[PDB]
């Protein structure tokens, strides 16, 4: 059982630069690439005495990829895997979707199969991208399209980064996010949302780092990814693989958007004082103060839930805590889901990165639920998309790249149809 991870965009490969740091530290791999079977789902045993990841970074600006080439992991990544174009898309869906992709995407999917061929029991692909950017949105959608044509039946997990409501780093990211999500609807199998204000609030509130950079963000995002692939890598009492998501978390094939959460996000000193038990971390993973997306599930109704447990946990107390939640009435499950939970238990405790801020913990929880607060997210983003589009601002950029207003209108109404869908199910 093997899984390969592809990273699209400048945020993608920074997420990768944290995930693969965590994987190597988890399996005791030196940054040179070799140890001084459980790893087989990520690293291949090259040649002799050398483990090379199952990953492809790809980007259009050469700056950040070449920084990876000169970073600490110079030899830990195969030279051919880190693809890189000559000029970026520059915050432009059209420029990233019609001009430069037609050259780089053919080489990229020619190199992913040269990876899937080495694989034998491929569990699925999983993608990392920020839809706000240019190459993350456009080329990302172009790659996802040709992936669906080439493989189709294999699962394509997605961890995307939407623009935050009020904190934002761009202006045309509404246009980019919308024109990206029209393909993100019907091409990815499972899609997990990751906003940045939510992560900023977590690192400010819980970990009380007053000045966090993106590194700390990437660190705990890698904690989330590691915790939901740990069932493949290590062994537990009740394991769930990558196929279980598309079974137990998506009640209707067009509804795959899942809020994530993590607990306990605790610093070095608060570890000594809080007696970490399963009950209170199962509570802690449910407050809006500890979610990975700035939304409120109080406004929404949980359509399903998944609970990944790592460390010193027995099925007894996790079943006890999940009972208390099911009986509490502060949060409300949907009527059509009688058993809106799915638990998964793993024994390997989550490791720490020295220099990181989390402490050595005995047990952790990674919650992935499906709700209707996401239907609130898309509407709040649609509102400010039509705000700009009413004056046709920035449109000349895309039409200059060669596109038209047709996909503007059809992406707008496609989002409208999705809001109608979310309000329906949530009945």
């Amino acid at each position: 059982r093997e899984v390969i991870s592809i990273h699209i965009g400048q945020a993608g490969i920074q997420v990768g630069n944290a995930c693969w740091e965590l994987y190597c530290l988890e399996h005791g791999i030196q940054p040179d690439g070799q140890m001084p079977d459980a790893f087989n789902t990520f690293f291949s045993e090259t040649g002799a005495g050398k483990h090379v990841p199952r990953c492809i970074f790809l980007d259009l600006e050469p700056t950040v990829v070449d920084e990876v080439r000169t970073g600490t992991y110079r030899q830990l990544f195969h030279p051919e895997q880190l693809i890189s174009g000559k000029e970026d898309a520059a915050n432009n869906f059209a420029r990233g979707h019609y001009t430069i992709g037609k050259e780089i995407v053919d080489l990229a999917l020619d190199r992913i199969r040269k990876l899937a061929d080495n694989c034998t029991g491929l569990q699925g692909f999983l993608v990392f991208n920020a839809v706000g950017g240019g190459t993350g949105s456009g080329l990302g959608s172009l790659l996802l399209e040709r992936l669906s044509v080439d493989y189709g039946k294999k699962s394509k997990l997605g961890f995307t980064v939407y623009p935050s409501p009020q904190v934002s780093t761009a202006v045309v990211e509404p246009y980019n996010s919308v024109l990206s999500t029209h393909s993100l609807l019907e091409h990815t199998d499972v899609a997990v949302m990751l906003d940045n204000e939510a992560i900023y609030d977590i690192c400010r509130r819980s970990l009380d780092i007053e000045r966090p950079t993106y590194t700390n963000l990437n660190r705990l995002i890698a904690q989330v990814i590691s915790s939901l692939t740990a069932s493949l890598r290590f062994d537990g009492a009740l394991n769930v693989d990558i196929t279980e998501f598309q079974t137990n978390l998506v009640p209707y094939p067009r509804i795959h958007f899942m809020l994530s959460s993590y607990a306990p996000i605790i610093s070095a000193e608060k570890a000594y004082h809080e007696q970490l038990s399963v009950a209170e971390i199962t509570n802690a993973a449910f407050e809006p103060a500890s979610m990975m997306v700035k939304c409120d599930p109080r406004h929404g109704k949980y359509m399903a839930c998944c609970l990944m447990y790592r460390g010193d946990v027995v099925p007894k107390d996790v079943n006890a805590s999940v009972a208390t939640i099911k009986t509490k009435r502060t949060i409300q499950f949907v009527d059509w889901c009688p058993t809106g939970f799915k638990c998964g238990i793993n024994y390997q405790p989550p490791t720490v990165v020295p220099g990181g801020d989390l402490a050595k913990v005995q047990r952790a929880v990674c919650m992935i639920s499906n709700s209707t607060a996401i239907g609130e997210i898309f509407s709040r983003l649609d509102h400010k998309f039509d705000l700009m589009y009413a004056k046709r601002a920035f449109v000349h950029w895309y039409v200059g790249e060669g596109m038209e207003e047709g996909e503007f209108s059809e992406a707008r109404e496609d989002l409208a149809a999705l809001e109608k869908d979310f309000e329906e199910v949530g009945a």
Partner: protein, 97 residues
């Protein structure tokens, strides 16, 4: 409460009285790291402010100390299995390979 003075005689001994009988033994200053911890911290901070390298990108400045620190004492966290309250031992449900 912290008993800063070594010999814990009495609460009212530290107060200033008119009488020299006790005024001799009232302590004036409590010297120790238990007090100087704050200046230790902030002097470390002023030192790292004063001595800085210009060409240290943040991305790589974060990783290098980590890659050194784990290399110093390499321990691989082995899978801990919660001991069930019985003579039976867990024998987990799955095993990787």
């Amino acid at each position: 409460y912290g008993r800063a003075d070594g010999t814990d005689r009495r609460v009212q001994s530290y107060l200033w009285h008119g009488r020299k009988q006790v005024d001799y033994f009232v302590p004036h200053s409590t010297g120790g790291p238990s007090t100087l911890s704050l200046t230790a911290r902030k002097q470390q901070e002023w030192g790292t402010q004063g001595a800085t390298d210009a060409y240290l990108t943040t991305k790589m400045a974060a990783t290098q100390p980590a890659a050194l620190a784990t290399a110093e004492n390499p321990t691989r966290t082995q899978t801990l299995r919660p001991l069930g309250d019985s003579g039976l031992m867990p024998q987990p449900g799955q095993k990787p390979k």
